Amino acid sequence: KSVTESFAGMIHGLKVNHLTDGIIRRSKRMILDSLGVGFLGTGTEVFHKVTQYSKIYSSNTSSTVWGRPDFRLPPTYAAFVNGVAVHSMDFDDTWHPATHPSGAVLPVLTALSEALPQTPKFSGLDLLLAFNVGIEVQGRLMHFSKEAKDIPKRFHPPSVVGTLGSAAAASKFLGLSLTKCREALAIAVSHAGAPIANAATQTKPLHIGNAAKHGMEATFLAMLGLQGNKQILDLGSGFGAFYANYSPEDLPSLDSHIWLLDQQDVAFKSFPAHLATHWVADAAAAVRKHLVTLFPADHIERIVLRIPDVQYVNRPFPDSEHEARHSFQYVACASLLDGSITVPSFHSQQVNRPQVRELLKKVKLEHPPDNPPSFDTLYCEISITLKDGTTFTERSDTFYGHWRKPLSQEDLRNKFRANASKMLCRDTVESLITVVEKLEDLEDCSVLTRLLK
Amino acid sequence: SVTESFAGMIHGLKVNHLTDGIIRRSKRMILDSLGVGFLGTGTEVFHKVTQYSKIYSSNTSSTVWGRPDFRLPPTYAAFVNGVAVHSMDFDDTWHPATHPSGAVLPVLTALSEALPKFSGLDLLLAFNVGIEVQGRLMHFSKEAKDIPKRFHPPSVVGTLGSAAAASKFLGLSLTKCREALAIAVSHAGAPIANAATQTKPLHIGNAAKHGMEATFLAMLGLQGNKQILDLGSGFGAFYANYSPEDLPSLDSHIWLLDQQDVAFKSFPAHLATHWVADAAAAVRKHLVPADHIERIVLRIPDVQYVNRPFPDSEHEARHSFQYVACASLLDGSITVPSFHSQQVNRPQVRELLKKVKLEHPPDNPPSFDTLYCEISITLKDGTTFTERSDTFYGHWRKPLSQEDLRNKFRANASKMLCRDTVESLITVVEKLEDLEDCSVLTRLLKG
User: HEC states along chain A?
Assistant: CCHHHHHHHHHHHCCHHHCCHHHHHHHHHHHHHHHHHHHHHCCCHHHHHHHHHHCCCECCCCEECCCCCCCEECHHHHHHHHHHHHHCCCCCCEECCCECCCCCCHHHHHHHHHHCCCCCCCCHHHHHHHHHHHHHHHHHCHHHCHHHHCCCCCECHHHHHHHHHHHHHHHHHHCCCHHHHHHHHHHHHCCCECEHHHHHCCCCHHHHHHHHHHHHHHHHHHHCCCCCCCCCCCCCCCHHHHCCCCCCCCCCCCCCCCCCCCCCCCECCCCCCCHHHHHHHHHHHHHHHHCCCCCCHHHEEEEEEECCCCHHHCCCCCCCHHHHHCCHHHHHHHHHHHCCCCHHHHCHHHHCCHHHHHHHCCEEEECCCCCCCCCCCCCEEEEEEECCCCEEEEEECCCCCCCCCCCCHHHHHHHHHHHHCCCCCHHHHHHHHHHHHCHHHCCCCHHHHCCCC
DSSP B290: G
Question: Could you tell me the resolution of this structure in angstroms?
Answer: 3.3
Residues of B in contact with A57 (CB under 8 A): 56-58, 73
What CA–CA distance (Å, rounded) separates B186 from B211? 10
Residue in chain A nearest B198 by alpha carbon: A227
Nearest CA-CA distance, residue B221 and chain A, Å: 8
Q: What are phi and psi of A364, to 5 degrees?
A: -110, 140
Check chain A for breaks (C–N over 2.5 Å) and list the residue before each, or none.
Answer: 293
Residues of A in contact with B198 (CB under 8 A): 226-228
Strand pairing partners for B388? B374
Strand pairing partners for A303? A363, A384
Cα separations in angstroms, A36 against A208, A445, B433: 16, 18, 56
Q: Which of A201, A206, A207, A233 to mutate to test the interface with B (most CBs of B within 10 A)?
A: A201
Closest CA to A127 of A433, A439, A438: A439
What CA–CA distance (Å, rounded) separates B424 from B440? 10
Nearest CA-CA distance, residue B9 and chain A, Å: 22
Q: Is B61 helix (H, G, I), strand (E, B) or coil?
A: coil
Residues of B in contact with A60 (CB under 8 A): 55
B39 touching chain A per CB within 8 A? no
What CA–CA distance (Å, rounded) separates A331 from A380? 12
What CA–CA distance (Å, rounded) separates A322 from B226? 14
What CA–CA distance (Å, rounded) separates A305 from A384? 9
Residue A425 burial class via C-beta count within 10 angstroms: exposed 0-12, middle 13-18, buried 19 and up: exposed
Strand pairing partners for A95? A99
CA A391 to chain centre: 37
Residue in chain B nearest A227 by alpha carbon: B198
Strand pairing partners for B378? B295, B384
What CA–CA distance (Å, rounded) separates A434 from B343? 63
Residues of chain B numbered 154-193 and touching chain A (CB < 8 Å): 155-156, 182-183, 185-193
Residue B293 burial class via C-beta count within 10 angstroms: exposed 0-12, middle 13-18, buried 19 and up: middle
CA B142 to chain centre: 20
Q: Which amino acid is at B216?
A: F
Task: Tally Cβ neighbours within 10 Å of residue B369.
Answer: 15
Q: What are phi and psi of B362, to 5 degrees?
A: -60, -25
Residues 6+ apart with CB under 8 A from A25: none
Residues 6+ apart with CB under 8 A from A52: B220
Residues 6+ apart with CB under 8 A from B301: B147, B272, B360, B364, B365, B366, B367, B371
Closest CA to A277 of A230, A223, A324: A324
Strands B71-72 and B384-389: unpaired
Tell me if B189 and A227 make a contact (CB, 8 A cut-off): no
What CA–CA distance (Å, rounded) separates B266 from B93? 12
Residues of B in contact with A46 (CB under 8 A): 222
Q: Which of B43, B56, B75, B209 to mutate to test the interface with A (most CBs of A within 10 A)?
A: B56
Nearest CA-CA distance, residue B287 and chain A, Å: 38
Nearest CA-CA distance, residue B58 and chain A, Å: 5
Nearest CA-CA distance, residue A406 and chain B, Å: 32
What CA–CA distance (Å, rounded) separates A156 from A312? 12
Give every strand in the sheet of A380-386, ordered side by side: A363-366, A300-306, A380-386, A391-396
Tell me if B58 and A53 make a contact (CB, 8 A cut-off): no
A94 touching chain B per CB within 8 A? no
Residue B34 burial class via C-beta count within 10 angstroms: exposed 0-12, middle 13-18, buried 19 and up: buried
Q: What are phi and psi of B192, to 5 degrees?
A: -70, -20
What CA–CA distance (Å, rounded) separates B104 from B209? 10
Tell me if A195 and B55 make a contact (CB, 8 A cut-off): no
What CA–CA distance (Å, rounded) separates A305 from A284? 9
Element (H, E) at B296: strand B293-299
Domain coordinates of chain A in residue numbers? 1-269+401-453, 270-400
Residues of B in contact with A311 (CB under 8 A): 233
What is the separation, in whole angstroms, between the first and last Cα of chain B?
Answer: 46
